[PDB]
Amino acid sequence: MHVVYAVEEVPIPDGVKVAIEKTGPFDYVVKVKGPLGELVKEFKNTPVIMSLSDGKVVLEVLNAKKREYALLGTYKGILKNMFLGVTKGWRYKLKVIYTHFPMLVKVQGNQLTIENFLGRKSKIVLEIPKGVKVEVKGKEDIVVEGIDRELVSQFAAAIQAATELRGEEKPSPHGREGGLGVVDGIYVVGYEHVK
RNA sequence: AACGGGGCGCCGCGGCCUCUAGUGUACCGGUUGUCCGGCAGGGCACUGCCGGGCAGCCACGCCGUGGGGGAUAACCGCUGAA
Numbered sequence: 001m002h003v004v005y006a007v008e009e010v011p012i013p014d015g016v017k018v019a020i021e022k023t024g025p026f027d028y029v030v031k032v033k034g035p036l037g038e039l040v041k042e043f044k045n046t047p048v049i050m051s052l053s054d055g056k057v058v059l060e061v062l063n064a065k066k067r068e069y070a071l072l073g074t075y076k077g078i079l080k081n082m083f084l085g086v087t088k089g090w091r092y093k094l095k096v097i098y099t100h101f102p103m104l105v106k107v108q109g110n111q112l113t114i115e116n117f118l119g120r121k122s123k124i125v126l127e128i129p130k131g132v133k134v135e136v137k138g139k140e141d142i143v144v145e146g147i148d149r150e151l152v153s154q155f156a157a158a159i160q161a162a163t164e165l166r167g168e169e170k171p172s173p174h175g176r177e178g179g180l181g182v183v184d185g186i187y188v189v190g191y192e193h194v195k
Numbered sequence: 196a197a198c199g200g201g202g203c204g205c206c207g208c209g210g211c212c213u214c215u216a217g218u219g220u221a222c223c224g225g226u227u228g229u230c231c232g233g234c235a236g237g238g239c240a241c242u243g244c245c246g247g248g249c250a251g252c253c254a255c256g257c258c259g260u261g262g263g264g265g266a267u268a269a270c271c272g273c274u275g276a277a
């Protein structure tokens with residue numbers, strides 16, 4: 001369905017400064033400064049109009065179809081996430097699961113390593129991005145903290161995908177006669193705010 | 196069973212001749228029948244035949260022959276509205 005005018009307003013929280021800048025004919029750059037840090041996002045080639053109105057960020061479209069109109073609600077979700085990112089932070093929690101070979105997980109500098117995954121002599125090594133803090137709690141839990149939800153969630157997804165083999169290395173999920181198979185790995189259990 | 200680690204091949208490609216092998220009517224030796232009077236030396240038997248064999252060529256011999264980056268496919272995920 002066609003749309004003539006649509007509008008979405010996002011409420012800026014206390015202590016959070018937003019700078020919406022135009023870097024092209026339809027290109028934006030949004031910098032969000034908070035107590036927890038500074039977030040910078042790009043919105044390139046967008047029909048959505050971004051503007052600041054007295055403590056609010058204004059999103060509007062004009063002559064918009066369904067494809068363009070749904071980008072108002074998407075950008076409200078993104079902008080809210082960046083506000084919470086610099087006011088409360090994000091914490092993604094992972095649980096380590098194994099059956100016979102315990103998975104020695106350690107954080108060495110900016111590298112994350114996992115040992116003995118299924119007894120493999122090989123090592124899993126993941127570079128930790130800047131602005132992402134990785135900690136190993138106990139032997140069984142991992143927490144990723146940061147102010148960017150996309151960057152924290154992306155790294156937490158790459159840890160889980162590390163312990164998921166593909167091709168002919170993939171073990172059977174179910175055991176003999178329908179039982180639980182060899183399911184060992186690191187799984188994202190959920191997310192939370194640092195504060 | 197697997198990942199990861201170490202070692203080597205086969206097929207192909209590109210070179211090389213130190214070794215080994217082949218050839219080597221350059222060369223050296225042995226020997227048959229006959230002719231040059233005999234010895235010596237030699238012609239011919241289409242290198243007469245047999246053995247060895249430098250160089251050159253050559254393989255049946257030796258040498259080299261890799262990992263990475265990007266955008267991607269099938270697809271797997273993050274965030275994420277309509």
Ligand SMILES: [Mg+2]
């Ligand atoms: Mg000969």
Ligand SMILES: [Mg+2]
């Ligand atoms: Mg004589």
Ligand SMILES: [Mg+2]
Binds near residue numbers: 238239
């Ligand atoms: Mg004569």
Ligand SMILES: [Mg+2]
Binds near residue numbers: 241
């Ligand atoms: Mg002759």
